[PDB]
């Protein structure tokens, strides 16, 4: 598992896409559209750059890109953790919005919001799984991993009045 790199600024601060053959491992927040400092493959680093491109600077077009395959070792093995990455990544799309509690019934158990708000914060691709989208029932925005501004700069992103 050779891991390949390469950093992309963004409207959020520069940005670092690791990843190898077999898929994206993650998408870290370091702290005008820009190119990826290192050009050229693996094909997942790649997709994700377009992707990334895309979902801050041509929204309109997000569906179009193919999301990369993942590879880092949380999605290597089941678990609930797991479970609620992927469901969160298949169902919330952009503009939309889901609380802990239904993301939890989603996941298959409607008692264990608590076990998906830490799940969020085992998200190592953040904005492609967008934990980002998952917020309070009373209507709060909610704690994020990386940081409430971030959080909110994302839903206004997509149309919320933030
Ligand atoms: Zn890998």
Not at 89 to 117: C, D, H, M, T, W
Not at 135 to 151: F, P, Q, R, W
Request: include cysteine; charge should be neutral.
């Amino acid at each position: 598992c050779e891991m390949k790199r390469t950093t992309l600024d963004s409207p959020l601060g520069k940005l670092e896409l690791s990843g190898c053959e077999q898929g994206l491992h993650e998408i870290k927040l370091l702290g005008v559209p820009a190119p990826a400092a290192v050009l050229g493959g693996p094909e997942p680093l790649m997709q994700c750059t377009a992707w990334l491109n895309a979902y801050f600077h041509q929204p309109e077009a997000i569906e179009e890109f193919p999301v990369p395959a993942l590879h880092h070792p949380v999605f290597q093995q089941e678990s609930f953790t797991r479970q609620v990455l992927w469901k969160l990544l298949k169902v919330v799309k952009f503009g939309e919005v889901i609380s802990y509690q239904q993301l939890a019934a989603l996941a298959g158990n409607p008692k264990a919001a608590r076990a998906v708000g830490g799940a969020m914060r085992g998200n190592p691709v953040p904005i492609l799984i967008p934990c980002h989208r998952v917020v309070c029932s009373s209507g709060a925005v909610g704690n994020y991993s990386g940081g409430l501004a971030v959080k909110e700069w994302l839903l206004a992103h997509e149309g919320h009045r933030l």
